[PDB]
């Protein structure tokens, strides 16, 4: 927010600082010597700095934008499902009428036409998860024999819920035209009593996706997985974590991830190398379990935050690792490109700046992913090939762009702002080329959601203070692509649109209020409201208010920049996008 933090911090203190007998605020000239009215007296040593118009609030501002864009654009917008226990009425079973409607509505052609569409389209995701789709086609065939049975085997119940998770993922990437052609739009809105004029992109495609997730749940609740741990729970949870559900529900997915990690560590299996005396069955089991566990670590990372108490990733991709690099770079490539970003993010919330040697080592291994994704094969028509290709291309460009964002913020290396501008437009052009058929659901993975979450945050945020030409040209395509995101995201999409609106009105708020000099402490509503709202969401994360209800029926007890601050606090309030 506000300190002095100006350009060209000098080398040696002057006489006035030696008189001053405090910390050497070795700026041009000092925030403390200017506070004593002796600004020029600290200037008079040698090479009297430069123009006093370099926006000295801006580095402090970007330091607090780190505080924001950590605690808002992952934590505040997505990872606070601030709901209630008293104000939420109970649901004892309530899916013997609801999930059984999905027992009703599911058809065999409605199963297999999703199944065969998602075969070459999504043939890396389940291939990363489980492998073969024909065994899964066999489970859908026997599933109509395993449909309304009486001898519900626990294992077979996991197989039943497995294909509900598969149907969830098939909804998550099928376009709406084939969805309305394979399924029917109307019996959902018959059963719910909702509107008939609701072609699936208008809200209920992702709801039916969540209903298939919920019917996986309704059988997994019957699987008794807390007394029956197995790997398919974790596999289907990978498949469900591919959806928007971890962002639309952080807390439930946290506990399910907790049970999945407990399930894995029940096995006490770590290494993934088929040694001399190993079973070939155990060999292939370890080979599969490798990608399983690294996708599990990827699921551990995306939900990580203050609602994530139990951690899994305990390794470093550079420089106390557990099984690191004893592993063939095939889909742990997908993990390692994520763990690349993971080690960046132990410096987002904490304002301690990482060593730039580390960041340039990251700049070195950046191109290793860039040209190991080029080290794959290529298939024009197999949609999983270009699908996985664009996934990894997007991930390395995403971490690249965020890395150059970190370069500009933490140290401001050469031309890193223009690097941000360049990689932003390259990624957005990749989205534009995937505005097509066969590639609209290259735009449905939550990586593009969280990526545009950062882009429309910071490009608008730098548009606030620097009315730049390239930032304006990018801001046009920001406002275009914000409306032109796919409907597979839904509620957080509209929360993102409100966030874009509130940041534009935050720009107007900077436009209407001049920044008050008070020696070197600057004052604006942009400062104080963003000071407050993060702490509001932290007090929501201070879950004592959800435990004050747990320890009985107890009830607790807990100027110009006081007015317009507290006018914009409810004018464009954050409470629209908490939930």
Partner 1 sequence: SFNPVRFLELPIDIRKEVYFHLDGNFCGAHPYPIDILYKSNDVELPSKRSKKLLRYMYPVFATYLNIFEYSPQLIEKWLEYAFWLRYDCLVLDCFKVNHLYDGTLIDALEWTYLDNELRLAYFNKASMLEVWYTFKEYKKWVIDSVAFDELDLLNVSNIQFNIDNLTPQLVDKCLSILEQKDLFATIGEVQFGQDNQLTSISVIRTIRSMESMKSLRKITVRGEKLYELLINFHGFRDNPGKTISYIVKRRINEIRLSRMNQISRTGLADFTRWDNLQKLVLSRVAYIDLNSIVFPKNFKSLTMKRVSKIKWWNIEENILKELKVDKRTFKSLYIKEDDSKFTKFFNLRHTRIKELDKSEINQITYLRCQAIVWLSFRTLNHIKLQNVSEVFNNIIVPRALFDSKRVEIYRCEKISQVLVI
Partner 2 sequence: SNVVLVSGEGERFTVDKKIAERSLLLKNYLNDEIVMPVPNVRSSVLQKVIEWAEHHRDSNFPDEDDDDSRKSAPVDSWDREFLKVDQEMLYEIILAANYLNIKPLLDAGCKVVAEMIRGRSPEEIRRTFNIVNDFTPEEEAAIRRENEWAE
Q: Enumerate residues 8-37 that contact partner 2 by CB under 8 A.
A: 10-13
Task: State the nearest-atom distance from the C-beta of 517 to its own copies, in Å.
Answer: 5
Considering the rule CB under 8 A, would residue 12 count as an interface residue with partner 1? yes
Residue 298 and residue 304: Cα distance in Å, rounded? 10
Tell me how far, at minimum, the Cβ of 258 lies from partner 1, in Å. Answer: 30
- 84's contact among partner 2, its own copies, partner 1, none, with CB below 5 to 8 A by partner kind, is its own copies
Angle (deg, nearest 10), helices 204-223 and 231-241 = 170
Structure tokens at 519: 């020696």
Candidates 252-260, 327-335, 465-473, 559-567 — which segment interacts with partner 1 by CB under 8 A?
327-335
Nearer to partner 2, 45 or 349 (CB): 45
Considering the complex, what minimum distance in angstroms separates the CB of residue 41 from Zn ion? 7
* Contact flag: residue 255 with its own copies (CB under 8 A): yes
* From 329, 521, 532, 569, residue interacting with partner 1 (rule: CB under 8 A): 329
Q: Which residue has the CB atom at the shortest distance from Zn ion?
A: 42
Candidates 42, 169, 520, 529; binder of its own copies (CB under 8 A) is: 520
Contacts of 326 (CB under 8 A, 6+ apart): 271, 272, 273
DSSP string, 119-144: HHHSTTHHHHHT--SHHHHHHHHHHT
CB distance 212 to 102 below 8 Å:
yes
Residue 397 main-chain phi, psi, to 5 deg: -70, -35
559 membership: H or E segment, kind and range: none
Alpha carbon distance 444, 487 (integer Å): 8
CB 317 within 8 A of CB 378: no
* Footprint (CB under 8 A) of partner 2, residues 340-379: 364, 367, 370, 374
Q: Is 59 in the site for its own copies (CB under 8 A)?
A: no
CA–CA separation, 128 and 136 (whole Å): 14
Beta carbons within 8 Å of 457's beta carbon, 6+ residues apart:
68, 69, 72, 73, 499, 503
**Long-range CB pairs of 270-277, under 8 A, 24+ apart, other chains included:** 270/322, 270/323, 271/323, 271/326, 272/323, 272/326, 272/327, 273/326
Which H or E element spans position 487?
Answer: none
User: At its nearest, how many Å lie between partner 1 and the CB of residue 375?
Assistant: 4
- Residues followed by a gap in the chain, C→N > 2.5 Å: 319, 558
CA distance 246 to 253: 6
Instruction: Report the candidate in 549, 539, 554, 578 with the shortest Cα–Cα distance to residue 88.
Output: 549
Options 7-15, 113-121, 246-254, 321-329: segment touching partner 2 (CB under 8 A): 7-15
* From candidates 23, 46, 92, 281, binder to partner 2 by CB under 8 A: 46
CB of 291 to partner 1, least distance (A): 13
CB burial class (10 A; 0-12, 13-18, 19+) of residue 430?
middle
Q: Which CB sits closer to its own copies, 272 or 461?
A: 272
**Choice between 35 and 81, CB closer to partner 1:** 35
35 binds partner 1 (CB under 8 A): no
Single out the segment in contact with partner 1 by CB under 8 A; choices: 221-229, 242-250, 294-302, 322-330: 322-330
User: Can you tell me which of 19, 47, 357, 438 binds partner 2, judged by CB under 8 A?
Assistant: 47
CB 336 to partner 2: min, Å:
18
Nearer to its own copies, 349 or 468 (CB): 349
Residues 332-351 touching partner 1, rule: CB under 8 A, are: 336
State the minimum distance, in angstroms, from the CB of residue 316 to partner 2: 19
Q: Which is nearer to Zn ion, 14 or 564 (CB)?
A: 14
| Contact between 16 and 38 (Cβ < 8 Å) | yes
Pick between residue 47 and residue 512 the one whose CB is nearest to partner 1.
47
Residue nearer to partner 2 on the CB measure, 6 or 244: 6
Distance in angstroms (rounded) separating the CA atoms of residues 66 and 362: 19
First to last CA, the chain: 26
Reading the block at residue 507, the tokens are: 């720009």
Could you say which of partner 2, its own copies, Zn ion, none residue 437 binds, taking C-beta under 5 to 8 angstroms by partner kind? none
Query: Which one, of 69, 6, 57, lies nearest residue 514 by Cα?
Result: 57
Instruction: Categorise residue 27: left if φ over 0, alpha if ψ from -120 to 50, beta otherwise.
Output: beta
Beta bridge partners of 523: 516
Residue 275 lies near partner 1 (rule: CB under 8 A): yes
Tell me the HSE value of 472 on the side-chain side, using a 13 A CA sphere.
5
Say whether residue 573 binds partner 1 (CB under 8 A): no
Kindly state whether residue 422 participates in binding partner 1, applying the rule CB under 8 A.
no
- Closer residue to partner 1, CB minimum distance, 46 or 514: 46
| CA nearest to 57, candidates 525, 523, 550 | 523
Based on CB atoms, which residue is closest to Zn ion, 18 or 134? 18
326 binds, among Zn ion, partner 2, partner 1, none (CB under 5 to 8 A by kind): partner 1
- Residues 6+ away with beta carbon under 8 Å from 144: 108
Residue with tokens 């993934």: 272
Nearest-approach distance from CB 389 to partner 2, in angstroms:
9
Q: Which does 393 bind (CB under 5 to 8 A by kind): its own copies, partner 2, partner 1, none?
A: partner 2
Closest approach, Cβ 88 to its own copies, in A, equals 5
Residues 92, 227, 276, 414: which binds partner 2 (CB under 8 A)? 414
For the CB of residue 18, give the shortest distance to partner 1 in the complex, in Å: 13
Burial (0-12, 13-18, 19+ Cβ within 10 Å), 83 = exposed
Residue 355 as a binder of partner 1 (CB under 8 A): the answer is: yes
Per-residue x/- marks for its own copies, 196-235, CB under 8 A?
A: -----------------------x-xxxx--xxxxxx--x
Sites for partner 1 among residues 372-411 (CB under 8 A): 372, 374-377, 411
Asked whether the beta carbons of 109 and 182 are under 8 A apart, the reply is yes
- Footprint on this chain of partner 1 (rule: CB under 8 A): 11-12, 26, 47, 273-276, 278, 280, 283-284, 287, 325-329, 336, 352-353, 355-357, 360, 365, 368, 371-372, 374-377, 411-414
- Footprint on this chain of partner 2 (rule: CB under 8 A): 10-13, 45-47, 364, 367, 370, 374, 393, 397, 400, 414-415, 418-419, 421-422, 425-426, 429-430, 470
């Amino acid at each position: 927010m506000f300190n002095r933090t100006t350009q060209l911090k000098s080398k040696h203190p002057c006489s006035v600082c030696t008189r001053r007998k405090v910390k050497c605020d070795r700026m041009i000239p000092c925030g403390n010597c200017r506070k004593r009215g002796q600004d020029s007296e600290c200037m008079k040593s040698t090479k009297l700095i430069t123009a006093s118009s370099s926006k000295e609030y801006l580095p402090d501002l970007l330091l607090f934008w780190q505080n924001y864009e950590y605690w808002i654009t992952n934590i505040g917008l997505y990872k606070t499902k601030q709901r209630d226990l008293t104000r939420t009425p109970a649901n004892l079973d309530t899916d013997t009428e609801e999930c059984m409607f999905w027992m009703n509505y599911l058809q065999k052609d409605q199963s297999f036409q999703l199944m065969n569409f998602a075969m070459e389209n999504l043939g890396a995701l389940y291939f990363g998860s489980i492998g073969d789709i024909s065994e899964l086609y066999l489970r859908v065939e026997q599933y109509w024999d395993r449909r309304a049975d009486k001898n519900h085997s626990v294992d077979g119940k996991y197989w039943d819920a497995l294909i509900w998770s598969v149907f969830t993922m098939c909804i998550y990437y099928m376009p709406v035209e084939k969805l309305a052609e394979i399924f029917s739009v109307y019996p959902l809105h018959e059963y719910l009593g909702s509107n008939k004029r609701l072609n699936w992109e208008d809200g209920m495609q992702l709801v039916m996706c969540q209903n298939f997730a919920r019917c996986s749940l309704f059988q997994l609740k019957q699987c008794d997985f807390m007394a029956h741990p197995d790997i398919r729970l974790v596999q289907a949870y990978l498949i469900l974590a591919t959806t928007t559900f971890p962002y639309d529900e952080p807390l439930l997915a946290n506990s399910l991830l907790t049970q999945c990690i407990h399930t894995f560590k029940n096995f006490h299996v770590d290494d993934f190398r088929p040694l001399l005396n190993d079973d070939p069955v155990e060999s292939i089991a370890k080979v599969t379990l490798g990608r399983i566990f690294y996708r599990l670590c990827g699921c551990d990372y995306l939900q990580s935050g203050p609602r994530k108490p139990i951690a899994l990733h305990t390794e470093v991709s550079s420089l106390n690792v557990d099984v690191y690099r004893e592993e063939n770079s095939t889909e742990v490539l997908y993990w390692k490109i994520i763990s690349l970003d993971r080690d960046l993010d132990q410096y987002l919330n904490k304002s301690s700046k990482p060593p730039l040697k580390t960041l340039d080592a990251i700049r070195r291994e950046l191109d290793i992913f860039q040209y190991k994704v080029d080290s794959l094969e290529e298939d024009f028509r197999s949609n999983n090939s270009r699908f996985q290709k664009f996934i990894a291309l997007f991930q390395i460009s995403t971490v690249s762009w965020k890395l150059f964002k970190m370069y500009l913020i933490y140290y401001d290396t050469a031309d890193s702002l223009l690097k941000v501008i360049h990689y932003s437009k390259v990624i957005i052009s990749l989205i534009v080329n995937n505005f097509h058929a066969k590639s609209e659901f290259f735009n449905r993975h939550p990586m593009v959601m969280q990526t545009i979450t950062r882009v429309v945050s910071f490009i608008s945020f730098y548009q606030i203070f620097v009315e730049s030409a390239a930032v304006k040209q990018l801001l046009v395509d920001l406002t275009e692509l914000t409306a032109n995101l796919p409907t597979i995201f839904g509620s957080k999409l509209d929360k993102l649109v409100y966030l874009t609106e509130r940041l534009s009105k935050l720009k107007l708020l900077w436009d209407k209020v001049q920044l008050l000099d008070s020696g070197d402490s600057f004052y604006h509503p942009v400062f104080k409201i963003l000071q407050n709202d993060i702490k509001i969401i932290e007090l929501k994360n201070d879950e004592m208010f959800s435990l004050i209800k747990g320890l009985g029926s107890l009830v607790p007890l807990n100027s110009d920049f006081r007015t317009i601050v507290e006018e914009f606090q409810s004018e464009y309030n954050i409470s629209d996008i908490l939930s």
